[PDB]
């Protein structure tokens, strides 16, 4: 038959929502850092196991209770209220380390205005040395300690890392990036000044060009020689790296960063304009579309990496050995540097990347504004202007350490220390709370009342012992295994692990603080206080 009715209906509407930066930039870097192919199967396994049920649970909670991530626990569990503060701290860390990629992309777009792209050659433009540009057009040999012009450009112009000898010695502040991050923060502040965006017409104009330009880039990379050598590396089973390597932590981090659960974005964006409107048929489709977009982005990235490895006549997993989040600005730059209309396509790609990053960061900073107004509506809910400006100033003051000369040493630290374990333990705590303290039977009855269809046997067993046990096992494996990294011939100092553990603790310590603080205000003995604090607050 092949009616394709599912592809016909609702797909043109769902495909416009799952467009974030966690799938075009975060997924390729994580996949290449752990090897292609051996990461897709654990990724999809962890997804199907603990990302779709949590997504559906958060959507149902936001649709039923209709409250922010700080006010949700006022009707579920008053003890576990520090989850809101943990989510706020996690979002602050995000906005502190997430805007660096946006500033780099804006600087690249600004520098990509000339007719001659700086990423093609390194003929002593500003500061170069030990260059190798002619790959195969002149048929020259490749030797050790040789770098392409793109890597030298990224390392010496947009992120001056030679000024700092490491993380222990940070240099000054580059104004060339501050002048762009200030404009980025001003544009962000001018977009959430009112906070009224539910079904605007801007989605149909900022989500149609990204997809067509991504397909153009895909067909350009496929029409490029040396592409078949990268496809085999992206589709290799490699059952050895699944057994006893520890790839589940990165997969879970990528899942919780790309989907949405963990940052309180779903409970804040879904608590309005929707109530009992065809539930159980949106979260799965959104997750499927997001996974498809992530797979397409990873396929394009690996197709470019295969050509890059075939040109260098080296291994696929040895091209970018210590390169972290710089995988995009190198492979994409080298791919655009071979297109006929290099300048125009580069400008269009950077523009769509900037717009996608803006659309992705507008939802992250919104889950905190609407959350405080639900807990303190007598002081902050009236202004709406002095609070968003204050949080913007706070996020800008905290984003000055990542703008240092050692930027690659700070972004790599807050990437798996403030987002990996923290979001994981926050999700585990909230899931076990909703499962045991609130009761799975009450949640199932509420879902049946608000939708008219009870969840299946697979969903009623996930939040009980499937996702919480998996999250606890991943947390234990992360705490028992050294998460030490390596980047640019300098792995990390000894105190880097302690600094990362302290950073990942200040966001989680809010929950025990509120647990030990709530038991003091309520009078009575220990058991009486526990019984009084377990029951939710009555209206």
């Amino acid at each position, epitope marked *: 038959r092949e009616t394709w009715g599912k592809k016909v209906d609702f797909l043109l509407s769902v495909i416009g929502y799952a467009v974030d930066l966690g799938n075009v930039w975060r997924f390729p870097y994580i996949c290449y850092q752990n090897g292609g192919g051996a990461f897709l199967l654990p990724y999809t396994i962890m997804a199907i196991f603990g990302g779709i049920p949590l997504f559906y649970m958060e959507l149902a909670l936001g649709q039923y209770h209709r409250n922010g991530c700080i006010s949700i626990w006022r009707k579920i569990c008053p003890i576990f209220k520090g989850i809101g503060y943990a989510i706020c701290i996690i979002a602050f860390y995000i906005a502190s380390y997430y805007n660096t990629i946006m500033a780099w992309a804006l600087y690249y777009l600004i520098s990509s205005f000339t007719d001659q792209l700086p990423w093609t*050659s390194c003929k*002593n433009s500003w*500061n170069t040395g030990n260059c190798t540009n002619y790959f195969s057009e002149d048929n020259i040999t490749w030797t050790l300690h040789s770098t392409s012009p793109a890597e030298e450009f990224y390392t010496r112009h947009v992120l001056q890392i030679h000024r700092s000898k490491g993380l222990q010695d940070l240099g000054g502040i580059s104004w060339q990036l501050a002048l762009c991050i200030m404009l980025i923060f001003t544009v962000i502040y001018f977009s959430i000044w009112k906070g009224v965006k539910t079904s605007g017409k801007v989605v149909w104009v900022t989500a149609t060009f990204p997809y067509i330009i991504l397909s153009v880039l895909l067909v350009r990379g496929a029409t490029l020689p040396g592409a078949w050598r990268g496809v085999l590396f992206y589709l290799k089973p490699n059952w050895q790296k699944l057994l006893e390597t520890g790839v589940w932590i990165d997969a879970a981090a990528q899942i919780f960063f790309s989907l949405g659960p963990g940052f309180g974005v779903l409970l804040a964006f879904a608590s309005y304009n929707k109530f009992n409107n065809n539930c159980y048929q949106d979260a799965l489709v959104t997750s499927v579309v997001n996974c498809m977009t992530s797979f397409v982005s990873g396929f394009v990235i690996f197709t470019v990496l295969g050509y890059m490895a075939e040109m260098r006549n080296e291994d696929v997993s040895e091209v970018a050995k210590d390169a972290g989040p710089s995988l995009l600005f190198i492979t994409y730059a080298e791919a655009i540097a071979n297109m006929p209309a290099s300048t125009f396509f580069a400008i269009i790609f950077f523009l769509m990347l900037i717009t996608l990053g803006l659309d992705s960061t507008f939802a992250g900073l919104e889950g905190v504004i609407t959350a405080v107004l639900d807990e303190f509506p007598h002081v902050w809910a009236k202004r709406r202007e002095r609070f968003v400006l204050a949080v913007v100033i706070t996020c800008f003051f905290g984003s000055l350490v990542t703008l240092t000369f050692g930027g690659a040493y700070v972004v790599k630290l807050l990437e798996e220390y403030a987002t990996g374990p923290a979001v994981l333990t926050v999700a585990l705590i909230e899931a076990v709370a909703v499962s045991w303290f609130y009761g799975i039977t009450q949640f199932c009855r509420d879902v049946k009342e608000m939708l008219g269809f009870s969840p299946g046997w697979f969903w009623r067993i996930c939040w009980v012992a499937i996702s919480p046990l998996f999250l606890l096992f991943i947390i234990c494996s992360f705490l028992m295994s050294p998460p030490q990294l390596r980047l640019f011939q300098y792995n990390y100092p000894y105190w880097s692990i302690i600094l990362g553990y302290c950073i990942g603790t200040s966001s989680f310590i809010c929950i025990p603080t509120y647990i030990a603080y709530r038991l003091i205000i309520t009078p009575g003995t220990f058991k009486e206080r526990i019984i009084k604090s377990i029951t939710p607050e009555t209206p």
Partner: antibody
Amino acid sequence: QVQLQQSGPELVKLGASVRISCKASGYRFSYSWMNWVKQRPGKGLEWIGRIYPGDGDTKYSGKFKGKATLTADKSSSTVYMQLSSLTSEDSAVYFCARSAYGSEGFAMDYWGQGTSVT
Amino acid sequence: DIVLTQSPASLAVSLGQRATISCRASESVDNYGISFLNWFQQKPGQPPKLLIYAASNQGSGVPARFSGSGSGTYFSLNIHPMEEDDTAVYFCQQTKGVSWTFGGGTKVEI
């Protein structure tokens, strides 16, 4: 070692044109710039322009933008320079200095013997 | 172009004396930590020879007599062990952008 030679002496004729070559050897030719300076008898040095082998860029100082024509040739690695509208003032010595390999951008001390025209 | 002038005009050659040559770079700034400025030396009748590059590093085949110092606008040269062989003309060229120009040159002769 990196050898660098030039042509021999010439004659500056009113209204004619000359051609000075610079054959470099001993390193990567199309990887570093090729400076061209002018030194009048008694006076100091005077920069003319630069040319990167490989059809990449073509720059000048500002006073010889119409009287100097830097031509490269990757076949024999001999950089040329064709002057136009000569006079009694252009009677000087033209050298050929190879630039550095990037960041520093200094002269690698591989200067020619000098093409003293008269 | 970046105007670069030298304040000294002519020094005196003396055994065991310090020589100071400075270049005016009022319109100049450091780009990536290395000062885009070089020091040359041209003997009478001989082609110019590289002496000190980047104003901090020593060139090729140059003794430890010449030592550069300074960053940003002002620069200096240390010619403390000056013998009768160091009688030449030293120039000053900057390599910031497309502004490559030489200086006036200071000849040393007693």
